[PDB]
C-alpha cells in the first residue's frame, strides 16, 4: 500500500490542520506544564498555554485512525513561532509524551525527522503559508462555536469526489476564531456542548469514515 | 441531568471493562515506562507492560465521549493485583498523566476518591468479580483477533432495548483472549488490522451512538 504523495492532488482527502500549536523549545526541552509551572506561574503570563498533550493525543488518535489505514489523511501543525509542520501518514510515533517532546525538540533543531529505514523524510517542517501545500480542490473549514449546527456526514456528503477538505482544528490556548481568517472558506459547529480537539478530530474522522466507506 | 445509579438495572447501557490493567504502585508512584525503564530493563522482565497511558487516554476519550453526555456509559478497570475499580460517569479528571498517576496511587492507598463537592464517592475500588456489579440483562463480550468479523451497529442493532452490553477491551501488555474466559459470552472482531484500546473504544462507542441515537 502507498499513501498520498505530494504529487497527488486528485484523491478526495482529509487534511487536518491543528492550528495555533504550542511548540516552543526553551531552556533543551519543550514548554510543558509539568516542570515549567514555576516559571510560567512565576512570570505571570497566561498559564493556560503549555499545550502539547492534546496535539500529542491528536497525533496518536489520528495517526492510529483507520483513515490513516486508508491513507486518506494529511495532517499539518501550525505553531506560534510561525512554524508549519507536515506530519506523515507513514511515520510511527512512540506512545510516550517525553520521547515525543524531545523528538519535537530535535524536529525544531534540524527541521526534519528522517526515517530510520527509508530514504524519505517523515516529519518535514515546511513553508508558510498552508495554501502552498493545500490541494486546489480544497474546502478550507474550521470548527467553531459561534457557527450554526452542521452535520459532518451530510456536509462531506455534499462534498464531491474530486473535492478535498482541509479542516482547521483548534488545539490552541484560549482564543477566538480569527486565528485562520486569512484562509477560512467555512466555519462549522458539530455539537452544542464544548468539545476538545481530540474528540472533535475523532468524531469528524470517524464520521467521514462513515461517509467515505472505509472498511 | 442524573447519570445511571447502581439502583438502575433497566436502562440499556454500555459497560466498558478495561481488563488486565497495569496499576501497581511501587517505590510512591505507579509503574511507568518513563522512569522505571532502568529497573524493568535491568531486572529482565518483559518491559512491555508499564501501560497506563492507554487506559489514561481511554479514560479521557470515553469520559469525554457523548455517551457520557447521555450518561449511558459505565466503565470498570481490572488490574493485575485483582483490583477492580468503578469509574464514575460524573467524575472529572485532570488532563495530565502525572496527576492521574498520583491520583491512582492515592486511589490504591485509601481505595476511594471522594468528590471535592459531592458527598458520594467518584472512583470506587469494589469487589471481585465483575458479575456482582453487572446487570442481569447483560451481554458479556470481548474484542478479539481470532474471532470472525462482526459489525457493531448490526450487533447492538440485534440487541434489544432491555438488554445491556458489557464489553471487554484489552489494554493489557501482551496476552491471548483467555484473560476473561470465566465471564465471556461472546468474542467479536471489528476490523482485520490491529487496533488499539483507544480507537477500539472510540469506534465502538461512537458506533453505538449511531445505533442508540444520541444527538
Amino acid at each position: 500500500h502507498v499513501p498520498i504523495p505530494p504529487n497527488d492532488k486528485d484523491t478526495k482527502r482529509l487534511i487536518v490542520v491543528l492550528s495555533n500549536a504550542s511548540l516552543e523549545t526553551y531552556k533543551y526541552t519543550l514548554l510543558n506544564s509539568d516542570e515549567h509551572i514555576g516559571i510560567m506561574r512565576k512570570m505571570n503570563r497566561d498559564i493556560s498555554d503549555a499545550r502539547p498533550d492534546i496535539t500529542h493525543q491528536c497525533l496518536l488518535t489520528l495517526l492510529d485512525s483507520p483513515i490513516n489505514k486508508a491513507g486518506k489523511l494529511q495532517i499539518y501543525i501550525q505553531t506560534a513561532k510561525g512554524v508549519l509542520i507536515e506530519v506523515s501518514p507513514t511515520v510511527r510515533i512512540p506512545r510516550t509524551f517525553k520521547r515525543f517532546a524531545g523528538l519535537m525538540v530535535q524536529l525544531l533543531h534540524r527541521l526534519s525527522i528522517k526515517g530510520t529505514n527509508t530514504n524519505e523524510k517523515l516529519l518535514k517542517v515546511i513553508q508558510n503559508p498552508i495554501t502552498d501545500h493545500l490541494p486546489p480542490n480544497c474546502r478550507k473549514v474550521t470548527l467553531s462555536f459561534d457557527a450554526p449546527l452542521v452535520r459532518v456526514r451530510d456536509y462531506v456528503d455534499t462534498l464531491g469526489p474530486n473535492e478535498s477538505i482541509c479542516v482547521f482544528v483548534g488545539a490552541m490556548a484560549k482564543g477566538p476564531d480569527n486565528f485562520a481568517d486569512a484562509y477560512v472558506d467555512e466555519k462549522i459547529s458539530i455539537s452544542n456542548y464544548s468539545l476538545s480537539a481530540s474528540v472533535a478530530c475523532s468524531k469528524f474522522c470517524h464520521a467521514c469514515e462513515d461517509a467515505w466507506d472505509i472498511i
Side-chain angles (χ1 to χ4, degrees), chain A:
Chain A
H1 188 274
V2 177
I4 295 171
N7 198 5
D8 194 3
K9 301 295 182 183
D10 198 6
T11 305
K12 188 185 189 297
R13 62 179 65 89
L14 177 60
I15 293 97
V16 173
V17 173
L18 296 174
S19 180
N20 195 2
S22 296
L23 293 176
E24 293 178 353
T25 300
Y26 289 162
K27 184 183 286 186
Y28 292 100
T29 187
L30 290 175
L31 184 64
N32 53 0
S33 294
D34 290 329
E35 63 183 0
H36 293 89
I37 190 67
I39 192 166
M40 293 184 287
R41 186 179 66 190
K42 184 177 180 180
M43 293 299 291
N44 289 318
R45 287 187 300 273
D46 290 330
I47 300 170
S48 178
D49 64 0
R51 179 62 65 198
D53 64 358
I54 292 176
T55 188
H56 184 273
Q57 68 182 359
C58 287
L59 192 144
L60 299 178
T61 303
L62 287 176
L63 286 180
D64 286 329
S65 178
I67 190 168
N68 194 1
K69 302 297 185 292
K72 293 183 182 292
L73 187 63
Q74 188 176 3
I75 178 167
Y76 294 94
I77 294 169
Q78 293 182 357
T79 66
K81 288 182 177 179
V83 177
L84 194 149
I85 300 168
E86 182 175 1
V87 175
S88 296
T90 185
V91 63
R92 65 180 65 87
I93 196 69
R95 306 296 298 169
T96 179
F97 182 75
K98 295 182 184 293
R99 293 182 184 272
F100 179 76
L103 195 146
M104 290 298 108
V105 168
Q106 64 181 357
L107 178 60
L108 291 174
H109 186 273
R110 290 182 180 178
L111 302 170
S112 293
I113 298 298
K114 290 182 181 291
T116 186
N117 290 318
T118 62
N119 194 6
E120 296 180 355
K121 298 181 185 292
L122 295 180
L123 296 175
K124 189 176 179 179
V125 172
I126 54 176
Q127 290 289 324
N128 287 320
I130 194 65
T131 188
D132 292 331
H133 300 283
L134 290 180
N137 288 318
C138 184
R139 293 294 296 162
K140 295 179 175 66
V141 299
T142 300
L143 278 81
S144 178
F145 183 73
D146 56 353
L149 181 62
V150 173
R151 186 172 181 267
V152 173
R153 186 176 179 178
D154 288 333
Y155 183 73
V156 300
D157 196 3
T158 55
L159 295 182
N162 200 7
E163 192 176 8
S164 298
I165 182 167
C166 176
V167 304
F168 286 160
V169 180
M172 66 189 75
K174 283 179 73 68
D177 55 354
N178 57 4
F179 63 97
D181 284 338
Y183 294 100
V184 167
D185 292 332
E186 186 173 359
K187 295 176 182 176
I188 60 170
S189 297
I190 66 171
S191 179
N192 292 319
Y193 294 97
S194 178
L195 294 177
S196 179
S198 179
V199 293
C201 288
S202 72
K203 288 294 287 185
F204 193 86
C205 77
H206 295 162
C208 71
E209 288 170 356
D210 290 331
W212 291 355
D213 294 331
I214 300 169
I215 299 299

